[PDB]
């Protein structure tokens, strides 16, 4: 994340840290969200290159990347489901959404705690009004050209950008569509970045925190007229329910 602040997972207990195994401790691969005690939602493009589930481990309750967090829960991935109509067109990912069924080494899934909670899915086709504050979090770099990672969870606030603006020529134009949503800071000072993909965009809907977006893509990071682009979760509830449901 560019801008925003270092934060504890208590502020974002649904954040799932997804690591990829090496041949050599696992490397942080991308973010995710705990939508069910046994199910985590992340971005499909995180996994399209090496889609075998054994390549990945999932940690819940992590404020610190690649070190031990008290309260941490470690999970193997028993099901790794990528959206079957996923595609990459231009710089955009379409149907960028993935499901991760998680289980501990003893066969359990997430146990609710201060640092580990589920996030509510939105109602069908329902988003917050455009211009609404939504939070984004993750282990991503603090600028696109930074060599280092902050190694520590970051959280920030962006505003929903209407499809009508976002599809304007000096914004994305037609390389976005209606099953994506844009989010940006009014003066372009904060945004999701390198390492944030798969992570949650949380809006307030019907008086509850709601997974509204999944960090997908965007041109450059916190750049004028170039909002962050997120998988619009409210259009994937049937697909989600066809699996976990």
């Amino acid at each position, epitope marked *: 994340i560019v801008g925003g602040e270092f934060t504890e997972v208590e502020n974002q207990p649904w954040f799932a840290a997804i690591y990829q195994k090496n041949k050599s401790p696992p490397s942080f691969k*991308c973010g995710g969200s705990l939508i069910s005690p046994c199910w985590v939602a992340s971005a499909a493009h995180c996994f399209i290159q090496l889609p075998k589930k054994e390549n990945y481990v999932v940690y819940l309750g992590q404020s610190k990347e690649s070190s031990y967090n008290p309260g941490e829960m470690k999970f193997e991935v028993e099901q790794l489901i990528l959206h079957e109509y996923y595609r990459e067109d231009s710089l955009a990912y379409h149907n960028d959404i993935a499901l991760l069924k998680i289980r501990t080494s003893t066969g359990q899934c997430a146990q609710p705690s201060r640092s580990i909670q589920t996030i509510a899915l939105p109602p069908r086709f329902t988003d917050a009004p455009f211009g609404s504050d939504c939070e984004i979090t993750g282990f991503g770099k603090e600028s696109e*050209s*930074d*060599y280092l990672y902050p190694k520590n969870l970051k959280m920030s606030v962006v505003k929903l950008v209407s499809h009508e603006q976002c599809m304007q020529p000096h914004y994305y134009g037609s390389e976005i569509n209606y099953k994506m949503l844009c989010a940006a800071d009014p003066e372009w000072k904060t945004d*999701s*970045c390198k390492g*944030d993909s798969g992570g949650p965009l949380i809006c307030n809907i019907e008086g509850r925190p709601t997974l509204s977006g999944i960090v997908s893509w965007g*041109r*450059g990071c916190a750049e004028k007229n170039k909002p962050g682009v997120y998988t619009r979760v409210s259009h994937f509830l049937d697909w989600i329910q066809s699996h976990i449901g």
Partner: nanobody
Amino acid sequence: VQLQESGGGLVQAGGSLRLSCAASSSYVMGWFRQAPGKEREFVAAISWSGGSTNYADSVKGRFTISRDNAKNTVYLQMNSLKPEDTAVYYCAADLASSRDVSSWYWGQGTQVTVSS
């Protein structure tokens, strides 16, 4: 893929040198180096628009990284060089998307030697 460096060589301390790298864009471009007895370290990086730039602390204020998106070229301007800067310099490309963890690709490198 194939990033090719050029411009290296022997310079006396306090002198200047300009490294060029040709790529064969949308990615972050950068420069790394490998000093004697050490593994490869980060030197500089720059996003596609020049909007974000970044340097290692040891080269701050006397190295300047630039970019030409027309010719797919990236440059490293090295001023006020010291014996500490003797290394094999590798231009690099971050071939990951703007929301993905960085995945660096390196050239074959070019020798830079600074006298004293």
